Ligand binder design. Structure first.
Ligand SMILES: Nc1nc2c(ncn2[C@@H]2O[C@H](COP(=O)(O)OP(=O)(O)O)[C@@H](O)[C@H]2O)c(=O)[nH]1
Ligand SMILES: [Mg+2]
Lengths: 91, 168
Protein backbone atom coordinates (compact mmCIF):
# COMPACT_ATOMS: atom_id res chain seq x y z
CA UNK A 1 0.00 0.00 0.00
CA UNK A 2 3.17 2.20 -0.33
CA UNK A 3 1.71 4.61 -3.02
CA UNK A 4 -1.56 5.20 -1.06
CA UNK A 5 -0.53 8.41 0.80
CA UNK A 6 -2.52 10.92 2.95
CA UNK A 7 -2.12 14.75 2.67
CA UNK A 8 -0.38 14.82 6.14
CA UNK A 9 2.24 12.21 4.97
CA UNK A 10 3.00 14.30 1.83
CA UNK A 11 3.30 17.52 3.97
CA UNK A 12 5.80 15.77 6.38
CA UNK A 13 7.69 14.51 3.25
CA UNK A 14 7.83 18.14 1.91
CA UNK A 15 9.25 19.57 5.20
CA UNK A 16 11.78 16.65 5.54
CA UNK A 17 12.90 17.08 1.87
CA UNK A 18 13.23 20.89 2.25
CA UNK A 19 15.23 20.47 5.53
CA UNK A 20 17.59 18.03 3.68
CA UNK A 21 18.04 20.15 0.47
CA UNK A 22 18.49 23.57 2.21
CA UNK A 23 20.06 22.34 5.53
CA UNK A 24 17.05 23.84 7.43
CA UNK A 25 15.28 22.75 10.69
CA UNK A 26 11.58 23.54 9.96
CA UNK A 27 9.26 21.60 12.35
CA UNK A 28 5.91 20.54 10.73
CA UNK A 29 2.77 21.67 12.66
CA UNK A 30 -0.22 21.05 10.32
CA UNK A 31 -1.67 21.35 6.78
CA UNK A 32 -3.80 24.54 6.27
CA UNK A 33 -4.84 24.02 2.58
CA UNK A 34 -4.41 21.14 0.06
CA UNK A 35 -5.29 20.84 -3.65
CA UNK A 36 -4.72 17.43 -5.30
CA UNK A 37 -4.81 17.29 -9.13
CA UNK A 38 -4.75 13.70 -10.52
CA UNK A 39 -3.10 13.11 -13.95
CA UNK A 40 -4.20 9.84 -15.61
CA UNK A 41 -2.70 8.15 -18.67
CA UNK A 42 -2.40 4.47 -19.70
CA UNK A 43 -0.92 2.71 -16.58
CA UNK A 44 -0.21 6.15 -14.95
CA UNK A 45 -2.01 7.30 -11.74
CA UNK A 46 -0.03 10.52 -11.01
CA UNK A 47 -0.87 13.41 -8.62
CA UNK A 48 0.35 17.02 -8.11
CA UNK A 49 -0.19 18.11 -4.45
CA UNK A 50 -0.43 21.90 -3.79
CA UNK A 51 0.06 22.15 0.01
CA UNK A 52 -0.12 25.14 2.37
CA UNK A 53 1.41 24.02 5.71
CA UNK A 54 2.42 25.62 9.01
CA UNK A 55 5.97 24.87 10.31
CA UNK A 56 8.04 26.34 13.20
CA UNK A 57 11.12 28.26 11.88
CA UNK A 58 13.48 29.39 14.70
CA UNK A 59 10.56 29.10 17.21
CA UNK A 60 8.09 31.11 14.99
CA UNK A 61 5.02 29.45 13.29
CA UNK A 62 5.14 30.39 9.53
CA UNK A 63 3.12 29.32 6.42
CA UNK A 64 4.82 27.55 3.46
CA UNK A 65 3.53 26.51 0.00
CA UNK A 66 4.88 23.10 -1.14
CA UNK A 67 4.33 21.18 -4.41
CA UNK A 68 4.84 17.37 -4.24
CA UNK A 69 4.67 15.26 -7.46
CA UNK A 70 3.72 11.53 -7.08
CA UNK A 71 3.99 8.98 -9.93
CA UNK A 72 2.33 5.53 -9.69
CA UNK A 73 3.15 3.78 -13.00
CA UNK A 74 2.72 0.16 -14.14
CA UNK A 75 5.56 -1.08 -16.42
CA UNK A 76 5.90 -4.76 -17.52
CA UNK A 77 3.61 -5.99 -14.68
CA UNK A 78 5.34 -4.02 -11.82
CA UNK A 79 4.15 -0.89 -9.91
CA UNK A 80 6.85 1.88 -10.03
CA UNK A 81 6.55 4.60 -7.28
CA UNK A 82 8.22 8.06 -7.34
CA UNK A 83 7.73 11.07 -4.96
CA UNK A 84 9.65 14.43 -5.23
CA UNK A 85 9.39 17.86 -3.61
CA UNK A 86 9.12 20.22 -6.65
CA UNK A 87 8.88 23.53 -4.70
CA UNK A 88 8.95 24.81 -1.08
CA UNK A 89 8.65 28.60 -0.38
CA UNK A 90 7.31 30.77 2.50
CA UNK A 91 3.83 32.28 1.67
CA UNK B 1 -18.79 8.33 5.33
CA UNK B 2 -17.26 5.46 3.21
CA UNK B 3 -17.19 5.45 -0.61
CA UNK B 4 -18.46 1.99 -1.70
CA UNK B 5 -16.70 0.29 -4.66
CA UNK B 6 -18.27 -2.94 -6.00
CA UNK B 7 -15.46 -5.20 -7.34
CA UNK B 8 -15.65 -8.62 -9.06
CA UNK B 9 -12.77 -11.16 -9.43
CA UNK B 10 -13.10 -13.35 -12.58
CA UNK B 11 -10.84 -15.84 -14.38
CA UNK B 12 -10.43 -19.58 -15.07
CA UNK B 13 -10.59 -22.15 -12.23
CA UNK B 14 -7.19 -22.45 -10.48
CA UNK B 15 -5.64 -19.01 -11.39
CA UNK B 16 -5.77 -17.78 -7.71
CA UNK B 17 -8.97 -15.62 -7.52
CA UNK B 18 -9.73 -16.91 -3.96
CA UNK B 19 -6.08 -16.67 -2.76
CA UNK B 20 -5.80 -13.05 -4.08
CA UNK B 21 -9.15 -12.01 -2.50
CA UNK B 22 -8.35 -13.69 0.88
CA UNK B 23 -4.83 -12.04 0.95
CA UNK B 24 -6.59 -8.63 0.71
CA UNK B 25 -9.26 -9.55 3.37
CA UNK B 26 -7.33 -11.76 5.89
CA UNK B 27 -3.67 -10.79 5.05
CA UNK B 28 -2.47 -14.41 4.62
CA UNK B 29 -2.17 -17.07 1.87
CA UNK B 30 -5.05 -19.61 1.93
CA UNK B 31 -3.80 -22.21 -0.58
CA UNK B 32 -6.79 -24.68 -0.51
CA UNK B 33 -10.11 -22.80 -0.73
CA UNK B 34 -12.90 -24.94 -2.29
CA UNK B 35 -12.68 -24.15 -6.05
CA UNK B 36 -16.55 -24.30 -6.37
CA UNK B 37 -17.37 -21.74 -3.55
CA UNK B 38 -18.22 -18.10 -4.38
CA UNK B 39 -18.28 -15.57 -1.50
CA UNK B 40 -18.48 -11.76 -1.13
CA UNK B 41 -16.41 -9.64 1.32
CA UNK B 42 -16.65 -6.09 2.76
CA UNK B 43 -13.15 -4.58 3.24
CA UNK B 44 -12.80 -1.12 4.86
CA UNK B 45 -9.55 0.39 3.46
CA UNK B 46 -8.19 3.97 3.06
CA UNK B 47 -6.98 4.55 -0.55
CA UNK B 48 -5.34 7.94 -1.35
CA UNK B 49 -7.05 9.42 1.79
CA UNK B 50 -10.54 8.11 0.76
CA UNK B 51 -12.18 5.80 3.36
CA UNK B 52 -13.44 3.01 1.02
CA UNK B 53 -15.73 -0.01 1.49
CA UNK B 54 -14.68 -2.62 -1.10
CA UNK B 55 -17.68 -4.94 -1.76
CA UNK B 56 -15.80 -7.83 -3.49
CA UNK B 57 -17.25 -10.98 -5.15
CA UNK B 58 -14.78 -13.88 -5.52
CA UNK B 59 -16.49 -15.81 -8.42
CA UNK B 60 -16.11 -19.65 -8.68
CA UNK B 61 -17.37 -19.99 -12.29
CA UNK B 62 -19.70 -18.39 -14.90
CA UNK B 63 -21.92 -21.43 -15.87
CA UNK B 64 -23.71 -22.66 -12.66
CA UNK B 65 -26.76 -20.50 -11.74
CA UNK B 66 -26.01 -17.78 -9.13
CA UNK B 67 -28.41 -14.83 -8.45
CA UNK B 68 -25.54 -13.19 -6.47
CA UNK B 69 -22.95 -13.56 -9.31
CA UNK B 70 -25.49 -12.23 -11.93
CA UNK B 71 -26.21 -9.20 -9.64
CA UNK B 72 -22.45 -8.44 -9.14
CA UNK B 73 -21.70 -8.97 -12.90
CA UNK B 74 -24.54 -6.55 -13.90
CA UNK B 75 -23.92 -3.83 -11.22
CA UNK B 76 -20.16 -4.41 -10.57
CA UNK B 77 -18.12 -1.20 -11.02
CA UNK B 78 -14.73 -2.85 -11.68
CA UNK B 79 -13.35 -6.32 -12.56
CA UNK B 80 -10.03 -8.13 -11.87
CA UNK B 81 -9.52 -10.49 -14.88
CA UNK B 82 -7.01 -13.04 -13.49
CA UNK B 83 -4.83 -15.57 -15.38
CA UNK B 84 -1.83 -17.60 -14.10
CA UNK B 85 1.57 -16.86 -15.75
CA UNK B 86 2.27 -20.68 -15.93
CA UNK B 87 -1.18 -21.50 -17.57
CA UNK B 88 -1.41 -20.43 -21.26
CA UNK B 89 -5.09 -21.65 -21.44
CA UNK B 90 -6.03 -19.30 -18.50
CA UNK B 91 -4.45 -16.37 -20.48
CA UNK B 92 -6.27 -17.40 -23.75
CA UNK B 93 -9.53 -17.48 -21.67
CA UNK B 94 -9.13 -13.76 -20.68
CA UNK B 95 -10.75 -12.68 -24.02
CA UNK B 96 -13.99 -14.58 -23.06
CA UNK B 97 -14.10 -13.10 -19.46
CA UNK B 98 -13.69 -9.52 -20.88
CA UNK B 99 -16.39 -10.22 -23.59
CA UNK B 100 -18.88 -11.40 -20.88
CA UNK B 101 -18.23 -8.19 -18.81
CA UNK B 102 -18.61 -5.90 -21.89
CA UNK B 103 -21.88 -7.75 -22.80
CA UNK B 104 -23.52 -7.61 -19.31
CA UNK B 105 -22.40 -3.91 -18.81
CA UNK B 106 -23.26 -3.08 -22.51
CA UNK B 107 -20.01 -0.97 -22.56
CA UNK B 108 -16.59 -1.01 -24.34
CA UNK B 109 -15.11 1.01 -21.42
CA UNK B 110 -15.55 -1.04 -18.15
CA UNK B 111 -12.98 -0.49 -15.31
CA UNK B 112 -10.72 -3.61 -15.39
CA UNK B 113 -7.21 -4.77 -14.43
CA UNK B 114 -5.49 -7.72 -16.14
CA UNK B 115 -3.81 -9.73 -13.33
CA UNK B 116 -1.05 -12.27 -14.13
CA UNK B 117 -0.99 -14.26 -10.85
CA UNK B 118 1.58 -16.85 -9.55
CA UNK B 119 4.50 -14.56 -10.65
CA UNK B 120 6.52 -16.34 -7.87
CA UNK B 121 6.76 -19.44 -10.18
CA UNK B 122 9.76 -20.29 -12.40
CA UNK B 123 7.35 -22.17 -14.77
CA UNK B 124 6.27 -19.02 -16.73
CA UNK B 125 4.55 -19.74 -20.10
CA UNK B 126 2.99 -16.23 -20.57
CA UNK B 127 5.75 -13.62 -21.16
CA UNK B 128 5.19 -10.25 -19.40
CA UNK B 129 5.34 -8.59 -22.91
CA UNK B 130 2.57 -10.93 -24.27
CA UNK B 131 0.25 -10.03 -21.32
CA UNK B 132 1.15 -6.27 -21.54
CA UNK B 133 0.42 -6.26 -25.34
CA UNK B 134 -3.06 -7.82 -24.73
CA UNK B 135 -3.87 -5.33 -21.89
CA UNK B 136 -2.63 -2.33 -24.01
CA UNK B 137 -4.91 -3.46 -26.94
CA UNK B 138 -7.90 -3.49 -24.46
CA UNK B 139 -6.84 -0.14 -22.88
CA UNK B 140 -6.68 -1.82 -19.41
CA UNK B 141 -3.76 -1.81 -16.95
CA UNK B 142 -1.67 -4.98 -16.35
CA UNK B 143 -0.04 -6.13 -13.06
CA UNK B 144 1.74 -9.38 -12.06
CA UNK B 145 0.82 -10.73 -8.60
CA UNK B 146 1.68 -13.60 -6.26
CA UNK B 147 -1.15 -14.47 -3.81
CA UNK B 148 1.55 -16.79 -2.28
CA UNK B 149 3.99 -13.92 -1.33
CA UNK B 150 1.28 -11.13 -1.45
CA UNK B 151 3.40 -9.37 -4.19
CA UNK B 152 1.21 -6.86 -6.13
CA UNK B 153 -2.05 -7.73 -4.22
CA UNK B 154 -2.71 -4.25 -2.71
CA UNK B 155 -1.60 -2.54 -6.00
CA UNK B 156 -4.01 -4.71 -8.12
CA UNK B 157 -7.02 -3.74 -5.93
CA UNK B 158 -5.92 -0.05 -5.54
CA UNK B 159 -5.36 0.13 -9.34
CA UNK B 160 -8.94 -1.20 -9.93
CA UNK B 161 -10.34 1.49 -7.53
CA UNK B 162 -8.28 4.19 -9.38
CA UNK B 163 -9.64 2.81 -12.74
CA UNK B 164 -13.24 3.11 -11.36
CA UNK B 165 -12.51 6.76 -10.30
CA UNK B 166 -11.29 7.62 -13.86
CA UNK B 167 -14.74 6.36 -15.13
CA UNK B 168 -17.18 7.61 -12.38
N1 LIG C 1 2.57 -20.72 -6.69
C1 LIG C 1 1.41 -20.07 -6.50
N2 LIG C 1 0.28 -20.80 -6.31
C2 LIG C 1 -0.91 -20.15 -6.11
C3 LIG C 1 -0.95 -18.69 -6.08
N3 LIG C 1 -2.23 -18.32 -5.86
C4 LIG C 1 -2.94 -19.46 -5.76
N4 LIG C 1 -2.15 -20.55 -5.90
C5 LIG C 1 -2.55 -21.97 -5.89
O1 LIG C 1 -3.28 -22.22 -7.09
C6 LIG C 1 -4.40 -23.08 -6.80
C7 LIG C 1 -5.70 -22.32 -7.04
O2 LIG C 1 -5.81 -21.16 -6.20
P1 LIG C 1 -7.31 -20.62 -5.91
O3 LIG C 1 -7.13 -19.32 -5.17
O4 LIG C 1 -8.13 -21.73 -5.33
O5 LIG C 1 -7.79 -20.34 -7.41
P2 LIG C 1 -9.26 -19.96 -7.93
O6 LIG C 1 -9.84 -21.24 -8.47
O7 LIG C 1 -8.95 -18.98 -9.03
O8 LIG C 1 -10.05 -19.40 -6.77
C8 LIG C 1 -4.26 -23.51 -5.35
O9 LIG C 1 -3.52 -24.72 -5.27
C9 LIG C 1 -3.46 -22.39 -4.75
O10 LIG C 1 -2.73 -22.82 -3.62
C10 LIG C 1 0.32 -17.98 -6.27
O11 LIG C 1 0.34 -16.72 -6.26
N5 LIG C 1 1.43 -18.72 -6.48
MG1 LIG D 1 -11.85 -19.85 -5.87
Amino acid sequence: ASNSLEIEELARFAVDEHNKKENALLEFVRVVKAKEQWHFDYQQYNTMYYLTLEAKDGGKKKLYEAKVWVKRQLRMGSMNNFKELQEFKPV
Amino acid sequence: HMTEYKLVVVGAGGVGKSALTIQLIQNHFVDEYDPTIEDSYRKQVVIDGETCLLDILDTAGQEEYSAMRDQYMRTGEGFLCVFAINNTKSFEDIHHYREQIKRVKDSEDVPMVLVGNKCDLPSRTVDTKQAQDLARSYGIPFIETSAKTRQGVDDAFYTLVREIRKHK
